[PDB]
Every structure is written in structure tokens, then in C-alpha cells.
């Protein structure tokens, strides 16, 4: 613990909306300090989204204006992508960082495969 709940794969409709669920059970004494979503590009994951103390940041150009991350429910940081393109198909990683009762930080991440259905 803590453990992210992320489906092994998700299929979305071409040009529609898709949700990549990423949730966890909030632990007492654990303070969420960072959320990242990454897309896999060969051997390296590339950050597409960051939520830190200044709010939300969409990084990689391919994702501007159509990427939203849930924020209303604690422990739900699911990624919503709108107007799904064929080339959005890839493995995506949800990554959450916490501060712990022992002053340390803990990171967890989990991978999902996004498939696009014509």
C-alpha cells in the first residue's frame, strides 16, 4: 500500500471521449503532492500531464486542450481524453506521489493500454 487501481486496457471510440481510470484509497497521514500521466514512447515514458502545487499543466503538444484529469473526489485522478485520435493508441502511466507520516515520499505508478476503436 498504497496501490493504484488502473484497468489493464481501455478501448475508446474514434473521435469520441475516453476515460483512463486511475484511483486509490486515501490513506490516513498520506498527503498527495504530485500527479503525473505519462505516455510510453518506446523505452521511455513521456509526461503529458502534471498536477502540482500550482495546479494542472498539459505538457506535450499532442494533448493541448483535450486532456482533463478528475479532481473532485480524493483518490480519483482518472484521465479523460476527448476527440480520441488513432495515434492516441499507446500505453499510458498514471503516477501519484505522496508525503508519508514518516516525512518520506512514496511514488506509485500503474500502466494501462489505450486502444482506439473505429
Amino acid at each position: 500500500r498504497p496501490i493504484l487501481e488502473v484497468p489493464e486496457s481501455v478501448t475508446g471510440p474514434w473521435k469520441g471521449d475516453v476515460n483512463l481510470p486511475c484511483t486509490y484509497d486515501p490513506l490516513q497521514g498520506y498527503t498527495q503532492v504530485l500527479v503525473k500521466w505519462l505516455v510510453q514512447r518506446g523505452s521511455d515514458p513521456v509526461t503529458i500531464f502534471l498536477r502540482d502545487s500550482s495546479g494542472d499543466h498539459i505538457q506535450q503538444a499532442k494533448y493541448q486542450g483535450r486532456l482533463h484529469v478528475s479532481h473532485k473526489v480524493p483518490g480519483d485522478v482518472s484521465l479523460q481524453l476527448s476527440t480520441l485520435e488513432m495515434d492516441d493508441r499507446s500505453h499510458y502511466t498514471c503516477e501519484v506521489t505522496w508525503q508519508t507520516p514518516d516525512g518520506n515520499q512514496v511514488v506509485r505508478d500503474k500502466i494501462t493500454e489505450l486502444r482506439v476503436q473505429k
Epitope: 506509485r108 505508478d109 500502466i111
Partner: nanobody, 121 residues
């Protein structure tokens, strides 16, 4: 669907084993793989892990330098090359698979599939 280890046995101290875990069911190239060990009457401890995609490797302090982990994606197999075997390495060794990427590879709750284990003495 199934993970099957192999390669365990009695080995003279300072020797070498090559442990192997054969995975069946998915493209495990997208799964992080780990090795865990549990000595008799002692708790399950992390030994080694290798992440999905790129071959990023991680080791427990105890086995660092002596142990190495590798993966043959085409064969769906992960190997644990055990060299310079101190006697404290006597334990059952288990392979495990999870969908972590670069973090959480020592947390046993982070692994969805487990092997039966293989004894090393």
C-alpha cells in the same frame, strides 16, 4: 495466467545459479517483473525487479552486485543470475508480475500474478 519458476537447488557457497521464470498468457513485455524470496520462518523480502519496455533494473541491497535480473521478451521469460552466493541467500525464490512502470516494484501488493517458488540453498 501462469508463472513457472525453475533453476533452484543446493549450491556450494560462492557458486552460481540461473533462475528462470516462464510467463504465459499476455504480452508480458508491458509488465514489470520481480523476484522475491522468503527464508524459513522469515518474511517475504524483495530481491530484484525489471521494468516493462526498457530494461531498467532494481536490486535489494543484500543481493546487489551478486545478483542480476534479465528478460527475454520473445520467450516471455525473466532470469535471475545468482553469483557469489552467500549462505544467507538460502530461501524460496518467487517471480511475480505487475503493471507498475518505474515505481512501487518492492511493494508486494503491487504484483497481480505470482509463481510457486523455487528453493535455493
Amino acid at each position: 495466467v501462469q508463472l513457472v519458476e525453475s533453476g533452484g537447488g543446493l549450491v556450494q557457497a560462492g557458486g552460481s545459479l540461473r533462475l528462470s521464470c516462464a510467463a504465459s498468457g499476455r504480452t508480458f513485455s508491458s509488465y514489470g517483473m520481480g523476484w522475491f524470496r522468503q527464508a524459513p520462518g522469515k518474511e517475504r523480502e524483495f530481491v530484484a525487479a525489471i521494468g516493462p519496455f526498457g530494461g531498467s533494473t532494481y536490486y535489494a541491497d543484500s543481493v546487489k552486485g551478486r545478483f542480476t535480473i534479465s528478460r527475454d521478451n520473445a520467450k516471455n521469460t525473466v532470469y535471475l543470475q545468482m553469483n557469489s552466493l552467500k549462505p544467507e541467500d538460502t530461501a524460496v525464490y518467487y517471480c511475480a508480475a505487475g503493471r507498475w512502470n518505474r515505481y512501487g516494484f518492492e511493494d508486494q501488493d503491487n504484483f497481480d500474478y505470482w509463481g510457486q517458488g523455487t528453493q535455493v540453498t
